[PDB]
Amino acid sequence: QWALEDFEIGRPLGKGKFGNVYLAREKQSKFILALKVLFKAQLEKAGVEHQLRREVEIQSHLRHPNILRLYGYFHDATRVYLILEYAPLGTVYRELQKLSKFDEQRTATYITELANALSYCHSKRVIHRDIKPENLLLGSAGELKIADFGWSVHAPSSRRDTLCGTLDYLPPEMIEGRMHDEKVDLWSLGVLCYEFLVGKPPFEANTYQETYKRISRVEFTFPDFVTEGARDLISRLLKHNPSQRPMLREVLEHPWITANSSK
Numbered sequence: 001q002w003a004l005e006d007f008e009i010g011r012p013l014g015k016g017k018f019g020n021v022y023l024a025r026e027k028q029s030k031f032i033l034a035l036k037v038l039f040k041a042q043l044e045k046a047g048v049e050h051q052l053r054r055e056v057e058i059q060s061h062l063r064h065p066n067i068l069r070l071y072g073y074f075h076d077a078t079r080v081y082l083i084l085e086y087a088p089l090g091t092v093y094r095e096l097q098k099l100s101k102f103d104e105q106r107t108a109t110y111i112t113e114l115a116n117a118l119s120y121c122h123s124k125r126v127i128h129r130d131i132k133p134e135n136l137l138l139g140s141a142g143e144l145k146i147a148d149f150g151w152s153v154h155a156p157s158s159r160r161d162t163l164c165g166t167l168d169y170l171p172p173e174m175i176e177g178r179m180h181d182e183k184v185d186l187w188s189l190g191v192l193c194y195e196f197l198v199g200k201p202p203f204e205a206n207t208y209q210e211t212y213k214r215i216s217r218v219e220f221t222f223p224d225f226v227t228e229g230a231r232d233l234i235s236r237l238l239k240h241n242p243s244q245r246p247m248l249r250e251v252l253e254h255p256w257i258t259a260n261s262s263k
């Protein structure tokens with residue numbers, strides 16, 4: 001069983017509330033990875049604990065090119081340690097900060113990786129992955145890996161959406177404190193797709209009340225430059241009624257997806 005001293009530690013890749021993710025490499029094989037460090041006196045108060053340690057078993061069994069792999073974990077006394085696959089390009093979020101908005105080539109391609117990721121997840125009885133741009137990492141050359149998992153680490157940047165970025169990705173069901181089911185995740189794709197193409201989420205607003213309002217009532221529009229197979233796609237992803245949202249495969253089929261993916 002691994003322990004901290006099997007690792008060299010590099011810079012923090014991100015700092016969240018429960019702890020940091022550090023660039024690390026195992027001492028022998030000199031293999032590079034990411035070491036996620038969770039304080040755990042932090043985890044008490046949030047009421048999150050050994051129920052998460054039953055949970056890490058899940059992400060441990062998930063294997064897929066578009067999902068960040070959790071190689072292993074250990075703890076000591078004061079800290080929990082997740083040994084994760086390292087993603088060299090970082091977050092689609094910084095990238096969107098750089099490019100301001102993406103083009104259709106990448107979007108449909110990112111959208112396809114995502115839909116593949118979640119289809120896999122679903123089949124494992126795993127739903128409601130956090131799909132926000134800051135939780136999405138870029139692997140070796142181009143690939144998209146859902147980082148999800150360990151609760152929201154940031155790499156230094158921004159200060160506009162710090163919070164007020166949260167709400168933008170939640171469908172009505174889930175904010176309305178109704179139940180949530182496996183269709184949640186299809187609403188997210190629609191929010192991503194719009195943000196990839198637009199460089200802002202469909203529902204962005206100055207206040208939480210207003211955002212909430214726009215989500216609840218599905219009030220969002222398109223700048224003119226958005227192509228109309230792209231409208232069709234988004235429009236069909238964001239449906240107040242979950243049941244009117246497609247299964248994941250339709251997404252993959254959708255004639256705009258199939259058209260524009262560099263893959």
Ligand SMILES: Clc1ccccc1Nc1ccnc(Nc2ccc(-c3nnn[nH]3)cc2)n1
Nearest residue numbers: 013014021034086087088090147153154155
């Ligand atoms: Cl999910 C996440 C978001 C922000 C920061 C760190 C993480 N966690 C992980 C997990 C596995 N790999 C990585 N890779 C990574 C690589 C580079 C950077 C970065 N961008 N700009 N400066 N450093 C961030 C994360 N992050």
